[PDB]
Amino acid sequence: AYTNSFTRGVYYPDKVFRSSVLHSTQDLFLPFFSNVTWFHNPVLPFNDGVYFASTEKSNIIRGWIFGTTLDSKTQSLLIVNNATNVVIKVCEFQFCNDPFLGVNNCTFEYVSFKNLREFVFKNIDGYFKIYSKHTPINLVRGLPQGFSALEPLVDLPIGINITRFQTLAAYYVGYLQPRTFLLKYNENGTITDAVDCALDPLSETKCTLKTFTVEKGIYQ
């Protein structure tokens, strides 16, 4: 099953303040109007990077696991949520399809429908990073049409090989793609509108001009 992503999955590409300005970047991003997979469950591929989101109420989701095996032979990445905060470790566990009940040769450790939570999980080869957002929403199961950017939480200096992930409300998964984007910054440093450059010829025109408004005419 599938659902429209609208304009979600934008995130701050660098630790740079900009104001009242349009800036452009090429990176792994979720395409606009892409089909996310609908859920309300299995192990899934990571591809080059994951977008993950859920219609939260009481922080139901307990965590995530990432790796090549997710099943010993290497320290697979483990992430867990306690209250408003996060516990992280890399572990050679070999649990069955109930890892939340299973509860390791470790080399790293760290600790930090009313709502929508959104996350991006990314490998840069210059180590691994996480970006996030939390908002209220209308109680609809499908992702509402609206805009805000995801903000960085951590860099994990871990070097772990990842090709799949698993999870410990409705929820959604999509995949990042190497794409150019245009990003609009308000006065207060904040990404506040965007264009996916490849989306359609009008979007490509906006990105050709480095603008959001296009006057009448013809443009190469």
Partner: protein, 98 residues
């Protein structure tokens, strides 16, 4: 006996952190977290988000920085500079200049 080892994992114990006093409103050479430059460092009201470290103008040139030892978001003005031109009457008539 203390043992020192180096692996491929990122080191969490460094204890270097080259730093100095921070001087406002004068032309100064500077480094912030490895961002080197020279100019007049000044105060600012520019609302950096908590993860943002540096700020840039329309032509990509740096205009602001976070002080890593405080909450200060500085604005960086370039060095004051300009062409120098000599006004002269013809040397056949006078040697005075401005």
């Amino acid at each position: 006996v203390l043992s020192f080892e180096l692996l491929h994992a990122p080191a969490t114990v460094c204890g270097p952190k080259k730093s100095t006093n921070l001087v406002k409103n004068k032309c100064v050479n500077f480094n912030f977290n490895g961002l080197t430059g020279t100019g007049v460092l000044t105060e600012s009201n520019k609302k950096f988000l908590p993860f943002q470290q540096f700020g840039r103008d329309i032509a990509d040139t740096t205009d602001a920085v976070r002080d890593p030892q405080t909450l200060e978001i500085l604005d960086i003005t370039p060095c004051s500079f300009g062409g120098v031109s000599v006004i002269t009457p013809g040397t056949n008539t006078s040697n005075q200049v401005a």
